[PDB]
Write a protein that binds this ligand. Sequence first.
Ligand SMILES: [Cl-]
Length: 281
Amino acid sequence: AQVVVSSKIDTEGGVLGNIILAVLNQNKIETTDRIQLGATPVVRKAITAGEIDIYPEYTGNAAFFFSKADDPLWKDAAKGYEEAKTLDYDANKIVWLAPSPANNTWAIALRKDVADKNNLKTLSDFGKYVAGGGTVVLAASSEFVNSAAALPAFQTTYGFTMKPDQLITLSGGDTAATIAAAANQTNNANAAMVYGTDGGIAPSGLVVLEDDKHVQPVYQPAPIIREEVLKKHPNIEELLKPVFEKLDLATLQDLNARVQVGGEQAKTVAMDFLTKNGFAK
Ligand SMILES: [Cl-]
């Protein structure tokens, strides 16, 4: 029986799904390609119904699957991973394999020139800079500026507030527009609302600030696999471990950018990543 590989329909799903596919093929596990099948609900329905076997899911998404969206545990990367793994095994006999360290969550990215000049690496650094009178204009969605769990939470935890003249507020939630604003200094923008592994970040010369006090839930991608399929191919676990360990934030940003900015096929990007790191030939 072929192992059915899938993913969510977004760019990163295509990248991670093709990475899984290629690792399996290189290690002589035959596959069926159902990559980029649909949105999260469609892919969840498919794996629980046994229509797909393995795909990349994010730790923090388990908060929504298991009716725990309001639980603070998801903001702790290790706790979130363990809770996702335990619940999906107990409820669904789905096995979570080793995660990537990349946190693909709501974030603030700064222009690299501003970050370098002011030695800003973390949101704590950013709060100190803003509170002290540092020059900032942040491009963000109305939802990000106003929803309790977003900018307001960052402001409270990191000790800063943003004035109206320090914000470019857009109606929609697409980070394409906010990334571009900061990249181009539109209306003096030097910061953008992003998700951590957004492909646009790499070529736009922005850098994601670390959420060092853990305000946002953590979304680490990991391959997850139906137990019965893993039992048939038990080496899948160890084969994917070093591969996902190498997928740090900047590496994933770059791979995503190759697809969504460079126009490369995800299959090609995945194979190049594996060959470069000794996981394929
Ligand atoms: Cl990382």
